[PDB]
Amino acid sequence: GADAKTVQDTVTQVIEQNMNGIDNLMYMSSNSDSTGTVQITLTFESGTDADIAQVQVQNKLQLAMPLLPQEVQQQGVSVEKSSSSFLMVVGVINTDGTMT
Amino acid sequence: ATRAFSQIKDAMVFAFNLPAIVELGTATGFDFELIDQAGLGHEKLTQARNQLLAEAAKHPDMLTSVRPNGLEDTPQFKIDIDQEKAQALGVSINDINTTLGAAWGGSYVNDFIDRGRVKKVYVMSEAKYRMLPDDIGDWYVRAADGQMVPFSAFSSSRWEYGSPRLERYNGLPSMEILGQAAPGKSTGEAMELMEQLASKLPTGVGYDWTGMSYQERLSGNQAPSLYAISLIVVFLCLAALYESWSIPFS
Amino acid sequence: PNFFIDRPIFAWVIAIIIMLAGGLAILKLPVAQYPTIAPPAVTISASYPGADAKTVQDTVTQVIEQNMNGIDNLMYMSSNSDSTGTVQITLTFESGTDADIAQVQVQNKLQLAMPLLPQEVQQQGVSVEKSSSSFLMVVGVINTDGTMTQEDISDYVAANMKDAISRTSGVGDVQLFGSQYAMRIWMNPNELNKFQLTPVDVITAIKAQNAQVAAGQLGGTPPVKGQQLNASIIAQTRLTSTEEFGKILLKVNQDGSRVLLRDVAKIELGGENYDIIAEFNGQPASGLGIKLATGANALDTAAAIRAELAKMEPFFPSGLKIVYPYDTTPFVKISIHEVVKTLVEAIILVFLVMYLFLQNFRATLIPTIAVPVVLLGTFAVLAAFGFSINTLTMFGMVLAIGLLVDDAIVVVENVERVMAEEGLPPKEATRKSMGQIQGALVGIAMVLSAVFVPMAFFGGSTGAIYRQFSITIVSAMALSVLVALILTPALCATMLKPIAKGDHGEGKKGFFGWFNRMFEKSTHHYTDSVGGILRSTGRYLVLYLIIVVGMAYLFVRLPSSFLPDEDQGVFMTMVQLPAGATQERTQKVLNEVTHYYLTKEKNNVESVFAVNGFGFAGRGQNTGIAFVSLKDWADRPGEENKVEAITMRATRAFSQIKDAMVFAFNLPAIVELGTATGFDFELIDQAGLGHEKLTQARNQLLAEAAKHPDMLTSVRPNGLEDTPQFKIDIDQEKAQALGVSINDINTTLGAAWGGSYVNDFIDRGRVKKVYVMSEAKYRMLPDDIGDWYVRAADGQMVPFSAFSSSRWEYGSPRLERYNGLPSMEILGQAAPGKSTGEAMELMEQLASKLPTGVGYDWTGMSYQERLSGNQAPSLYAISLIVVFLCLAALYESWSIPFSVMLVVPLGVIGALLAATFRGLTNDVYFQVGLLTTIGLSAKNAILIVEFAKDLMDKEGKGLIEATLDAVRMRLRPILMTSLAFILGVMPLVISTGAGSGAQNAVGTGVMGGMVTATVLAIFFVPVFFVVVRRRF
Amino acid sequence: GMAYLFVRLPSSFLPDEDQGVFMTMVQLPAGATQERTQKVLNEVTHYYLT
Ligand SMILES: C[C@H](CCC(=O)O)[C@H]1CC[C@H]2[C@@H]3CC[C@@H]4C[C@H](O)CC[C@]4(C)[C@H]3C[C@H](O)[C@]12C
Ligand SMILES: C[C@H](CCC(=O)O)[C@H]1CC[C@H]2[C@@H]3CC[C@@H]4C[C@H](O)CC[C@]4(C)[C@H]3C[C@H](O)[C@]12C
């Protein structure tokens, strides 16, 4: 429920400062939402080790963990090596209308 | 489709084809960012991004669509807790915050287990009691003695502003941009007539390039430096075979 | 071999190609200092606010050194544990290891460990990195106009500049010299006692008022039917200014009136800590101490920094210049040019000795045109194999002009000879010349890499160091073979101008004819006399064995080096004190120091960058590093201005009148590579005897190791010694009876005397830390305790002295531990007669004389097995095993390859002189250069032998009527090559200033070798061959 | 002639294909309701199904 300026000053910045010394780092976004949600993308060099690319972020997310408020900690952070756009979608519906 | 939607509409909606190859959206125009390299804060930076757009739309002959990406500054209901008053009534500040937080935003508590899989338990004020300003003074807290207090007894409530989407590029606050290269000159020129209007700005704000338009591309830069090296080495093959420097030309 | 001798161009193509090739390799290839040579350094750090080291080592340390395990290629584990709190734990990994997952398997076991360490250590942030081991380069900052101070500059940097630097493609660990600003609340106990307040209350009110809040929304999702609006709610927000931090409301006193923070504490926007303060040439200054992340090209990383401050320059404050005190970039990008320089003098110098002899331009351009091609080509094989342009590899380049020189020279000369003899047009002459040296040259392609290859498989630190050379040349070598087979001879077909049948052009020039008479005639005298040794075949043989005994005698007199110390223009000096003497007592030290460098050594010293309260051992208030810089080489002509002299005489000025232990040194050759200078012992508590007996045991060792000052000196402890500690013992029973919470008591001491981390306020758009800590005056001396008052179960204050004892006892500010268990590290050196290989064993044994439980072990700089004295003469064996294994094949005798091999000594006993007579040493560069001379030595002989063979088998002449014509028909190729090489290695052997330290080992060795390896080769090889032959 | 032609043609990368699958995005005077939004999707889903 938190507003974005009580998201960007309490979860965001405590990452964008504990993040560093990372191989082939290229740059770092930060979309910070009035929903709470807070992406931080780190692009890496083309042809890079996709994997440890994903890793050296994890380490500096852990040296960062117990700085973010308790709720953010218990609400779960989520680091991934995701793509950037939709692969495919899987639609589901109700025939008989026994659900909503 | 677009000429049907927006030609009679209230809000900004349009349909597109997804750029060639999923993810490979590094072709369609340019992408600018604006960085707070002096700690001037956001409120001046919304303001600076103003002056750029306003003085970049002055040339509709080298670039159009010089517009911000994401969202703009909505208004925000602000509650300022009169500590002195609230403390004097003997009500815990810890209480006050959680009862607003958990009322208007919801709180994560325990994890009950429905049917053999744990799911989350959310406590949050029922729907009707959380829609409008005055809905605040319905909310009551328990005190040091043991009696309730309205929020309005210990709160201010004023209409001001804020940004729902605060961006930041490489740690520092920044404001991203999305326009395109006008139908006569390339991004290789629509880039430079935007690398400079940014200098016309106030002290502290900076420029930088990121993502889809940070590279150097095909023809117009370095393809005719490899093309060179293609038809350098073709000649380098022939003379050997023809025992002449003046035959591989043929 | 022939395709091209008829067809000039098909060479020209493949030629052009490896020219174009290595060209696009100079470019796309990372220019570096040396290789990646560091054994994969990992480094866990962690802090604990104000806490003493024994409440650091038992609460953060041990909860790691036990949750750490199952980790790939683990080698060993340090543990420096500081009275500052700070707590390094280094895990070294195997050389060549996966630097990355090396760093990773530590992270995993740091996470299975996280919530065991106290809350503060957790919230204060742990920091695991894959850092280097020593300083890459430093970035000085200062104030011009003087509108800011010795922590305002640190701040501007730390908030504007450091928070980008650390995020740039493998920048392991940046160390800020000082601190980013921090909201400091300076607690006053007078003002706390009166108003009935604990630091507890001060802490809670901070966590109450200055905090960003869980919000909510109007038009909340989900909504009750059609609303119009939706807006985020803002509540309370983190405070921005000293002003509103003072505003915080604590109490509401008896008579309505308010007690705000301003009233109990002086609020100050200051630093996160006050131990590290740096002074660039004495002016208040902050810095950036950049460090590498193993497997990192630094001539890359520091060339793109630059690419972060070439963006922070316009958006500064008024007057804030950058200054460069410590840079390893001006050097290696000069060391480079200055070998590339040598490799064009090396060309221009050959362009002459090449000319003199053949005295004809359009011929000379042949053994000239070769150079570029093979070199450019070398650049190529490198790039696409596994290496990067560097010092070691750049020398090999100069060192490889040799195995390029000859087979060009000898093909070209070959045709001179062929045109001096029969009368065959340049073309015909070449195939008559080449089909007459074809396999010979394809011989020296394998036999001379047979000494070169094996040393590539060197172990440890020396490994890649040797792998550079023993391949950089090998490539250069085999590419001079395929060249001198395909382009060289082809060119010999084309631009080589025809010469009358039986000419030499004796006298017939005036200019150079009076120059040719001095040779052709003297070469007749040569041969008439090589017939004169061959009569008296014995008497010279007996001269030879003497040379060998002589040689061996010389080989055992020279001392053992690795890679010689260079003058770098950048050196440093360290400052130590009777530990726990004040930061201020320390500044008087740095001041005496910065003085000397800016007083007497003004001549040379450019800029000192002294840092107070930071040690090249570890942290404290009595630790100092003074980063010097010198002027630009040329402005320091002689030995007195070179580092060796300065530092030496520097110490004899400092300590000769001083109170504390301070001395300056040159940083060991190659950053990080500090694995050369002596030994390193550790002492382990393998019975749980505890520290207090182990300080004691380390006593008895030193005391009974200084008993032999004839096998080892400096047997001394490393780090720090046992300071005293103020101990407060809380009488629970009493304290509980007064009804005061133990939770209260501890926090009000902890937060008073060590400081506490609380909230994170946000100054100017970047969160920084809020530190509450007792004001300065109320925390200096013992009795300052009983000023401190706590609030009780009823509601009235109590002095600490009512419920405390306070006694003066001891402790250690630096508790070490090697591989989990407590240990005490040692630092002495190998006395000037016997090596570490013996100073190690006379210390592996005095340790047995110790009490039950204490143990020995070796770690770091002295855990390996090294160059000469162990396993170099087991590869040397395998070098000259396989050289012999090449030859017999070619000569169809087991008793002929001796003839060529017996030359090995003839070059050595010259190179050993150079090395002896000039104050020099036996080290890598030398052993490399030694290897080189062993190659040329056979190369020269191999020919004389091969032809001798040739004219006995393919033309069937007697033993004596052959060797002669061999020693004669190719004497010139030798003298030529010899004189070219010596006058083409000539530069290095002079040279000053820039990286010449190496350039002389490389040179001196090769020269003095290549001298004797000829004016002896030209005699003894015929006395070899013939006497090797008169034993069928 | 050739060169003249070579400089008249415009710069593409890899030409946009028809994919059978495309998409459309919906934006509003932000912080107008989820419900105000649904009236948008409804006008939209309409056009494609009308
Ligand atoms: C950059 C915006 C997207 C708006 C945003 O950034 O949020 C882009 C996405 C595709 C763009 C339109 C494509 C077709 C048209 C091309 C014309 O030569 C200029 C006007 C039009 C009508 C464009 C206007 C605008 O430039 C749009 C809508
Ligand atoms: C091992 C110590 C460092 C002290 C420490 O470990 O803290 C070393 C660092 C360089 C060493 C000095 C180098 C020059 C001298 C060489 C002599 O052959 C022995 C005495 C001297 C004067 C040495 C004394 C001592 O051995 C020093 C000072």
Curated annotation (Swiss-Prot), chain C:
The chain crosses the membrane at residues 9-27, 336-355, 365-384, 391-412, 438-456, 465-489, 538-554, 871-887, 898-917, 924-942, 972-991, 998-1017. The keyword Cell membrane applies. It comes from Escherichia coli (strain K12). NCBIfam families: 2A0602 (TIGR00915), PRK15127.1 (NF011706), RND_permease_1 (NF000282). This is Multidrug efflux pump subunit AcrB. Belongs to the resistance-nodulation-cell division (RND) (TC 2.A.6) family. Residues 28-335, 385-390, 457-464, 555-870, 918-923, 992-997 are periplasmic. AcrA-AcrB-AcrZ-TolC is a drug efflux protein complex with broad substrate specificity that uses the proton motive force to export substrates. Homotrimer, with large domains that extend into the periplasm, interacts with AcrA and TolC. AcrA may be required to stably link this protein and TolC. Interacts with AcrZ. Part of the AcrA-AcrB-AcrZ-TolC efflux pump. One of its GO terms (biological process) is xenobiotic transport. GO terms for molecular function: alkane transmembrane transporter activity; bile acid transmembrane transporter activity; efflux transmembrane transporter activity; enterobactin transmembrane transporter activity; identical protein binding; xenobiotic transmembrane transporter activity. One of its GO terms (cellular component) is plasma membrane. It is found in: Cell inner membrane. Coiled coil: none annotated. Induction: Positively regulated by MarA, Rob and SoxS transcriptional regulators (at protein level). Residues 1-8, 356-364, 413-437, 490-537, 888-897, 943-971 are cytoplasmic. The lineage of its organism: Bacteria, Pseudomonadati, Pseudomonadota, Gammaproteobacteria, Enterobacterales. Keywords: Cell inner membrane, Cell membrane, Membrane, Transmembrane, Transmembrane helix, Transport. It is a multi-pass membrane protein. InterPro entries: AcrB_DN_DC_subdom (IPR027463), Acrflvin-R (IPR001036), MdtF-like (IPR004764). The keyword Cell membrane applies. Disruption phenotype: Loss of susceptibility to contact-dependent growth inhibition (CDI); inhibiting cells still contact the target.
